[PDB]
């Protein structure tokens, strides 16, 4: 037997494996060490940590489930993260490429900070794209809109780095008037109004849907030409909401297309946007819910509409308003995986409670509008 002269009793330091690419090196840190100091310590000791500026890197604790990996906050101490001796910490690049389908419909790759929430990332995306009103925009994955949670990272929501995401307007709070003076901005307004009508986010009548498609034909084909714009020419799936495809609508569309005459592309776009904005459905987010009506024991489907100013009860078929409450009449709301409920305080006897799979989405849209209203009163 032999005693070790290097035996050192009562060591408290945390001993961690720092991983930088394929390099691994063990380092010792006081548990009170702040994350920003641990980073600085790693830059001073491991030359491979100087591959870029410090704002581009961070400390990352990986997990066998990628969505459970964690970026360490610079303002916290190491022992906050419950590290034990032998744990691995990555000094890891925060920027990853993100494929974004822009508003114009095109695809582009943008560098985003993997440690930030969708809300903070959206600031960066809008800034590069030149977008004014970034509180009004969100992201969806590739129908019913699968909105991402603004308060969470992409990683923690399961978004893989290869997935292409869509930038789309979510809150309809402010609208600048439509002029032909900026054709690039006019196009953005036209593509947005058009996709919402074709997607079904913006529900319209059959008659309006064919008027819109007429303008759409003027825009994509130019003036109507009886020789070429014959019967069977149109792929109706591309010009009408899904619910109206299975009707014999082509002749109504060609009629409205004819009625444009020699109308220019720019003028067709201005009229498409203005007709969209002129509809009572414009700017309303609709959700399918099920109501308990007194007596009738089966639940009747209904549309719940949200705007910047109110919540509304709307008939599923006719799209008429049965009942409206202003956001200032709402005391509380509550979402569940099965339900959504509104407390109106003094303005109503009884709560309004509906079955729905989208309670969390409803609550997030209401809370978002309220955030914008409060911000624009600072």
Swiss-Prot record:
It comes from Mus musculus. It comes from the Eukaryota. This is Talin-1. It is found in: Cell projection, Ruffle membrane; Cytoplasm, Cytoskeleton; Cell surface; Cell junction, Focal adhesion. Residues 254-378 are annotated as: Interaction with LAYN. Consists of an N-terminal FERM domain linked via a short unstructured region to a large flexible C-terminal rod which contains 13 amphipathic helical bundles (R1-R13). The rod begins with a five-helix bundle (R1) followed by three four-helix bundles (R2-R4). These are followed by a series of eight five-helix bundles (R5-R7 and R9-R13) in which the N- and C-termini are positioned at opposite ends of the bundle, creating a linear chain. The four-helix bundle R8 does not disrupt the chain because it is inserted into a loop in the R7 five-helix bundle. Part of a complex composed of THSD1, PTK2/FAK1, TLN1 and VCL. Interacts with THSD1; this promotes interaction with PTK2/FAK1 and VCL. Interacts with NRAP and LAYN. Interacts with SYNM. Interacts with ITGB1; the interaction is prevented by competitive binding of ITGB1BP1. Binds with high affinity to VCL and with low affinity to integrins. Interacts with APBB1IP; this inhibits VCL binding. Interacts with PTK2/FAK1. Interacts with PIP5K1C. Interacts with F-actin. Interacts with SVEP1. High molecular weight cytoskeletal protein concentrated at regions of cell-matrix and cell-cell contacts. Involved in connections of major cytoskeletal structures to the plasma membrane. With KANK1 co-organize the assembly of cortical microtubule stabilizing complexes (CMSCs) positioned to control microtubule-actin crosstalk at focal adhesions (FAs) rims. Residues 96-377 form the FERM domain.
